[PDB]
Each structure stands twice: as C-alpha cells, then as structure tokens.
Amino acid sequence: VKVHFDQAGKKVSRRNARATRAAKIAPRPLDLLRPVVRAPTVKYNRKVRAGRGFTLAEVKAAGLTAAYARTIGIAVDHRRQNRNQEIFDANVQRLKEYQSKIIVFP
Amino acid sequence: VTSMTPAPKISYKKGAASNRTKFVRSLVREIAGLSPYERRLIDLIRNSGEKRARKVAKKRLGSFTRAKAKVEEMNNIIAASRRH
Amino acid sequence: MTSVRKRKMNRSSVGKATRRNKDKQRKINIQSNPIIAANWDYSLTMAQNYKKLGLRAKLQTPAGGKEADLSKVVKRIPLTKPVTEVVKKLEELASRPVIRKERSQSEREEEWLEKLYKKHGDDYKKMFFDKKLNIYQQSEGDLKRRLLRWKKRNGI
Amino acid sequence: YLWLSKPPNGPTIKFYIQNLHTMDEXXXXXXXXXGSRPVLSFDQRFESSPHYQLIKELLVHNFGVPPXXXXXXXXXDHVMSFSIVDDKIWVRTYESLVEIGPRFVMTVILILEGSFGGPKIYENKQYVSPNVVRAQIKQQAAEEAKSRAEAAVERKIKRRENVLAADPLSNDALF
RNA sequence: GUUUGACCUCAAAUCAGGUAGGAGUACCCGCUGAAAAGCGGAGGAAAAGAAACCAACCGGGAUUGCCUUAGUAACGGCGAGUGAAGCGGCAAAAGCUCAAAUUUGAAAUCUGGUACCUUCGGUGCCCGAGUUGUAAUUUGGAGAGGGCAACUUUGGGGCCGUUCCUUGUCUAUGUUCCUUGGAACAGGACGUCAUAGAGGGUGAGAAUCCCGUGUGGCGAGGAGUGCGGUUCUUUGUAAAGUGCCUUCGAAGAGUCGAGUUGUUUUGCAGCUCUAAGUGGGUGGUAAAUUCCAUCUAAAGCUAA
RNA sequence: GGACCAAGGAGUCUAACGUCUAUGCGAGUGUUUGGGUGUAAAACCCAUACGCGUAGGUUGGGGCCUCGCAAGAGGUGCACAAUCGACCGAUCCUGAUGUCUUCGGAUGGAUUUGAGUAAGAGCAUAGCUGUUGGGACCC
C-alpha cells in the first residue's frame, strides 16, 4: 500500500530541478536536440515521435562530426539506422534549422 | 516511404578468418597433440568408419554439427599425417 | 520525535544543529553569464524569462499547454450564415573575435629550417633525400609547410 | 509443429498441435506397461482422401511396433484412437477403456516431397497459422486506431463548424 | 670452484606506512528459509545501466521510474484463482574504459625514502616495482600506418570579483482620552503604519508595548572552479581534428552448448560431457537443397 | 447477567462488479501520469496519447387537430406491445453456370435463431444502496 501524497510536492521539487539545472545551463536549453522519428508497430506506424539520437551518417550529412555535435547539444545514437528517405531528410532540415539559430561562444 | 538503402553493418567477427589466426590455431594443433577421446577418435575412424565415429563423437559432444566438424578435422589430421 | 536519539537530543544541552534552507531553495542565481545575470528577473520563470529573452527554453514539444496569455481578441467564425536585444548582445559577443595568437615556431627547429634553407635553398627533392639535418626524414610538403611558415615569420 | 518422415524417401508431412494434456492430472489416473504392442482405432474413413490415406499409412509405419520392443511379452490393452473431427485429428490413449494417456488435438498443415526438402506437393488451405491470427488482431486494432484518429479530426472540424453566429439584434452585436 | 654469485621460494622483524572488524540498519543488494525470522554487505541512495535488445513495422534504440497496455496474454485438480510483456505518453536523459597485432631508434610507467619548495601536491636525487609488460595510441560507431591538400586548435597558473555554505548586524506606526477591572491586551472616542493585520510574550481578545513579521541594506569567516575580469607565464619540429589517396586491418573457452539432478516458473546451482571462426546468438519467413531480419555473449565503470 | 457510580466501549475503511438518483456533456465522454502557471500540497490553463461507448404493413395508443353546445365522431398518431412481413447470420435439403475429378454454390425451400438490421446513448463525477474479498460490528 502506497499513496502519492507528494504528487503536488514532487512536481514543485521537479520544477526546482528544472529551475536549478537551468541555472547552471543558463543560455542552453535543458534538453538536447532530438530526432523526429516515425514509430514502429502498425498501430503507431503513422505516428511520428521524438527519437533518441540521429546517426553518424546523418550528422555528417549535416556537415559536422558527432563528437563535436555532442558539444553543441545534439543527441546522437550510433545504434539506430536510417532507412527511410523522408525521415532522414526532415531530420537533416531539423539539424540545419538548429544550426541556423545557435550562436556559439569561443 | 519510397526507399533509402542503409550501409549494412557487418561485425568484424563475421568478416573472415585471417592468415594469422589460422596459423595460430594450426600451430596450437600439433603442439597440443590429441586429447584422449581424440586419440580414441582417430583409431575409431581407422577401425569402424566415419558412421560410428560421428556417432561416438556426437555422444562425446552435445550436438551434431559440431560432431561433423570434429570428424572432418580428424580426417584433416589423418590426411596431413599419413600421406605426408 | 519518539526515537531515543531524538528525545535525548531534545533534552540535551547541546541544542539542535538547525539550518534554514527552504526559503533559499526557490531562488537561484544563474552563475554563468553576466549578461543573463543582468536580464534575469527572479519573478517570471525559467520559461517566461527565457521567452522574454528570445532563447528557446525547451527544445521541442512541451507537454501541456503554454500560456497564449490573451495577446489578441479572437472572434467567432460566422460559418457563412444566410443573408531580441539581449539576443543581439550575445550575438555580438559570440560575433566578437577573441584576441588570438598565431602559433609560432620553436627556435631549434626554425634554426634547423634555416640550415636547410641555406644548404639546399628552396628545392625540396634534394632536401628530402638529405641525410644530415633531415634525420627525422620529414614529409614532402611538411617541409614545404614549415618553410613557408618560417618565411612568413622571417626572411620573406 | 512436428514433422514425421521417412528419411531416405519422399514422404514428409507437417502437423500442427493443439490442446495438450499431460500425465500429471487425474485425466490419466493409471500407468501401463511401457512397451506393450499398440492397437489403433481409425475413427475416420482415411480412404477417400488420398492425402489422409497417406497420413494413415505413415502413421501405421511410424507407430507400428516390431517385436524388438522391450517388455512386449505383456499386452497392456494399449490402444490409441485417431479421430478427424472437422479436419483435426483428436488422438486419445486407452488401456472397457480408461483414458490413461496424453490428449491431442492435431492439425494437418502441408505435405511436401523428399526427406526434408523436396517440393511442396499438397497443402490444406483450411489451416491458419496462429501468427496470422495475431496479425489479424493487430491489423484490426490499427484500423480502429486510424478510424479513431480520423473521427477525432472530424470532431474538431464539427466543433469548429458548429459555431452559430449571433443575432444582429444583441448587445454584443451592437457593441 | 670444497669457492663465489645470480636468481627463485619461504621465513623473520617492538622496521616504515596504511587498512579490516563494532554500532545502527527506514530504504537497497546477496544468501538461507518456515509456520516472516535469520545471515552477510553497502550508500545517500543502492541496484540496474550503454543490447549476443525489442520487433516484423513507413521499424525502434542504455538503464530507471510513473500512466496505459491489463486484470489482458499466459498459467492453474484451466479449481481456488495466479498473473506478465512489446508498443504508446511522460519524467529523466550521457556516455564511456579494458583485453587483440612492437616504442623497439632506446620502460618512454609507478610506489616508497630523502633534500627542498608555493604542500589534498610539486621538483630533484636514490632505492626499488616492472619486459611473466608498467606508459602513449586503438575498443567496431572501427581503427592503425603512411602520403597529399589544406585549414583549425592549443596548456598552465595567480589575484580580485561572482557563485555556494556558515554566520553577524541594521531596517515601520498610540502605549492618545473615558468606563469597567486586582491587572486593560476588554468596551467606547480620536488616531498612525503597512511590501509589516504571520506568530508569540507582556497580570484578560495587543498591527501600532516588546520580540518579531515585511521590505531592503551592511558585514564576517569559509568552500570552490562554476564563470567574469585582470595579471604572470607558457614551443617543443608539441598535441589533435576534418576530407582524399595508398597499405593494412588482431579480440572475452571449463566458456557457448548437451545430458542429468535439485530449485524456481523459464532461469539459476551442482555433477558429467564439452565447441566454432565468412564465427556465434536470437526471431520470423517459405511458391521451399528457403531467404531475410537483428545483435556480438562469456571483461569493467557511469550521474539524473 | 448483574454491589453501585463515573469515563471509555462495538457495522469503520478500502477494492471489484450492480441497481437507483442527481449533475455536466452528448455519439461522444473522461483536466489533475504528466507539463505550464500560482497569492503555492489550493486554484487556473493544457500538448500527445490512453480508457469506455458510438460507427415495411395492420391493430392499438399518450396526446394533438377538426367537427360537434355537450355527449361523441373523424384524422394524424409518442412511448411500448401483438400480428404479418422483409433482410442479414445460422440451420438442413435443392446442387445449376461452370467443372483440373473432386472443386463449386446458383436458385428454390424449411423451422427456429438473434439485448440482429430496418435511424444511436453513452462517458464522467457525486450520493444512497446490493454481492464478494480484505481482521471487516465487537469479544
């Protein structure tokens, strides 16, 4: 037996985390740059979704290295495979738009 | 929704065997000699044929395709030794 | 307050090691850039304050509803009835070139290049197959790169 | 699934298995002498259908027991019965008869040539593999979700297209 | 040479330096286990955790936890009832390190002692450890050697702020008249403050009596690299990254697996047997002498 | 079953189905896992998912209309009921046009069938209650 009495409280604490982390990460977003990825499982195969990370080859197609891209806040998954054209292209456009909107301090 | 061909990632284990590792394994083979059931197994080939040899080897092993490879390996040993 | 420890610590002459924290955990300093530390407000939120900056606070797809906060009046459809600033400051700061230093050359190896420059001159196929003063057997073009850097540094 | 086949020869049949029952429960409640000669009970024609006739033949060759069986000097009244119900062979085991054995509901799938590889010669279309049943379940669920999403779209349309305009004579119309 | 010495092993040290135990034990992790108890081991969390994964799709992508899946699948004298998981939505997000081929143009590595120094350390010197392998480089997402073309990059301190902690101090307005009362903090009349009318005390219900409360301010002592300025230096043929070309291009065995026994509801354990390298694991698939999918086990760490 | 007296002292809570009633919306309904917000365990706003549901005639007959001063007459007929239908699914025969020699169901029958079609009613919350289980009124 357990009752979530702290449901109101923990959220507050969580936003405190979402405050406090943000304090350290002051210009940058809290979250990384995640891929837009179409789901499996025919019930959901029309659904698109947030994915974990893009790939090496896609980040190369964006025009940078993944080792550098992790410093730019772009989530990268090696074990994913890019197999759909439109997914790949839309995520490349996403990467380009993310590159357009950042300004990086030396 | 139309196509895109990924570059197929094959593990380096699945590529091939090198000259180095074949040399290593074959050089271990003559040094290690035969285990006693292998000493039995060459004699059992020479005496009662590969039928009973494969059956005894599968009894020593767990499965059957390993017994194939074991009998074929001892045939390779007999071919390497007796003619040469 | 019914453990033996808590009751003894209550009755003790030591006094409770009491520290107050609950007020100061809500407020945070941003610690990182003095520009954002200037424009930070401590009143709006992380979310509202990043929006008032112009920086995208969360990357993508917030769960829940944002504040559309009544910027405009929305009127009913008749259905055809019958008859930046701080962004600019940080953009200047990232656009600001840092005072960088050219990577120079070390004195021994530029002297080595100076020996090569007088021994062979400028040609590279002779100095590539030189034993003395090319004992590390430098690459054909690394020689060119180091000599061009040395010439731009000294001696045209 | 199982195959039973003559390993130098053309016969090869694939049967599906349903509804097993074991020796553990009271459904048996008796043991018999392991090695008695079996009797069969072909509770079906097995004659008019040539492939069922081959099934009956190969079950005779399979389940026929030569006298090299140990403990065969006793006959333990052992009998097994085969019954095509619709196209499913119910197989039962008796020892007056008491069910002393495991229980089958068995289903033909396909017949092919050779010893394990040779070309497919017969197949009953009446069998459905249960993977296809799960696939039907998932496809129907995906169709339901698609219809539910389209209906939610049309509900938001109708909510947008549900608004009735004000009268020209109202206070909000004036002001 | 009956001598002498390398080792190697094993002892001894009131030799030097360290460390183990016990308590507590809500949470965690192992072991044992009835009709829980017990044992062992930790921490502020622990565990788990970067696929020998899940799937069959227009594929997904470490672990963890929540909602849903769902009281479904499945199991069960299919009786009692037992009882999941994929996907989805969310929270949180982070990835890394070994072991395989030579640095052989120089073991480049480290403990310890000592002398100094700016001391959670640094430098020097000397014993040792170590080739029965300590460093650099490389963990498949490859990588390495070169070569070409370019570009692109540099590290270490200080100090002062800032940030964090622990404190210290300052920061409003009636004790105005009358009645009652032992005592006004009660009742009436007239007020003032307020970003302060929370609370408590003061001889009865006190914003205005006191402490506070509220708003801000000034300190003090630490922690600290989080960043922000200054300031001092840092190169030595030093280190790294990207594209192209050329030449190569090595990985977890008493393990995998098999049988049996116990145990659990398929793993685990014991006993016996015991492999492969275009290998192996796992799953669908068949118009069938099938094709295709998907990972790399038997080494390790990792916040939330 | 009892010396007296004071105090304490026995159908509570929760879960799953079920009826009824009230309320909101309505073929839809359900904010509160979670996010945003806040004067801060309150209130306020809500993205994507998910849950559950959705996807003919005759006789009457409430009324209503007409006429009738009224009594009554005529007409249209809510709900619902009965009949005769129809159709779908099943049922057992017919077994065509075709037919790979065993495939096929065309047409016509027959009874019942079914919370069947023939123009929805549900979802959510609360209350009172029914059954079951948790110690389950107490000893």
UniProtKB/Swiss-Prot annotation, chain B:
Lineage: Eukaryota, Fungi, Dikarya, Ascomycota, Saccharomycotina
GO process terms (BP): cytoplasmic translation
Name the record gives this protein: Large ribosomal subunit protein eL36A
Provenance organism: Saccharomyces cerevisiae (strain ATCC 204508 / S288c)
PTM (free text): N-terminally acetylated by acetyltransferase NatA.
Family recorded in the similarity comment: Belongs to the eukaryotic ribosomal protein eL36 family.
MF GO annotations: RNA binding; structural constituent of ribosome
Task of the protein: Component of the ribosome, a large ribonucleoprotein complex responsible for the synthesis of proteins in the cell. The small ribosomal subunit (SSU) binds messenger RNAs (mRNAs) and translates the encoded message by selecting cognate aminoacyl-transfer RNA (tRNA) molecules. The large subunit (LSU) contains the ribosomal catalytic site termed the peptidyl transferase center (PTC), which catalyzes the formation of peptide bonds, thereby polymerizing the amino acids delivered by tRNAs into a polypeptide chain.
Leftover remarks: Present with 31600 molecules/cell in log phase SD medium. There are 2 genes for eL36 in yeast.
Keywords: Acetylation, Cytoplasm, Ribonucleoprotein, Ribosomal protein
Subcellular location(s) per record: Cytoplasm
Shown stretch of the complete protein: 17 to 100 of 100
Subunit composition and interactions: Component of the large ribosomal subunit (LSU). Mature yeast ribosomes consist of a small (40S) and a large (60S) subunit. The 40S small subunit contains 1 molecule of ribosomal RNA (18S rRNA) and 33 different proteins (encoded by 57 genes). The large 60S subunit contains 3 rRNA molecules (25S, 5.8S and 5S rRNA) and 46 different proteins (encoded by 81 genes).
UniProtKB/Swiss-Prot annotation, chain C:
Family listed: Belongs to the NOP16 family.
Extra information: Present with 2860 molecules/cell in log phase SD medium.
Any one of the GO BP annotations: ribosomal large subunit biogenesis
A Pfam family recorded for this sequence: Nop16
Domain of life: Eukaryota
InterPro entries, A to Z: Ribosome_biogenesis_Nop16 (IPR019002)
Protein name (record): Nucleolar protein 16
Main localization category: nucleus
Compartments, as annotated in UniProt: Nucleus, Nucleolus
Keywords: Nucleus, Phosphoprotein, Ribonucleoprotein, Ribosome biogenesis, rRNA processing
Entry GO terms, CC: nucleolus; nucleus; preribosome, large subunit precursor
Subunit structure: Component of the pre-66S ribosomal particle. Interacts with NOP7, RRP1 and RRP15.
UniProt function note: Involved in the biogenesis of the 60S ribosomal subunit.
Phosphoserine PTM positions: S104, S106
Biased composition (Basic residues): 1-10, 17-27
Region Disordered, residue ranges: 1-30
Swiss-Prot record, chain D:
Any GO MF annotation of the entry: rRNA primary transcript binding
The keyword Nucleus appears for this protein: yes
Gene from which the chain derives: BRX1
Locations listed in the record: Nucleus, Nucleolus
Phosphoserine found at: S170
Statement: the UniProt record of this protein carries the keyword Phosphoprotein: yes
Similarity field: Belongs to the BRX1 family.
GO cellular component assignments: nucleolus; preribosome, large subunit precursor
Highest taxon of the lineage: Eukaryota
Primary subcellular site in the record, as a coarse category: nucleus
Protein name in UniProt: Ribosome biogenesis protein BRX1
Keywords for the protein's UniProt record, in alphabetical order: Nucleus, Phosphoprotein, Ribosome biogenesis
Misc: Present with 13200 molecules/cell in log phase SD medium.
Residues of the full protein shown: 98 to 290 of 291
Biological process, per Gene Ontology: endonucleolytic cleavage in ITS1 upstream of 5.8S rRNA from tricistronic rRNA transcript (SSU-rRNA, 5.8S rRNA, LSU-rRNA); exonucleolytic trimming to generate mature 5'-end of 5.8S rRNA from tricistronic rRNA transcript (SSU-rRNA, 5.8S rRNA, LSU-rRNA); ribosomal large subunit assembly
Subunit and partners: Part of a complex that includes BRX1, RPF1, RPF2 and SSF1 or SSF2.
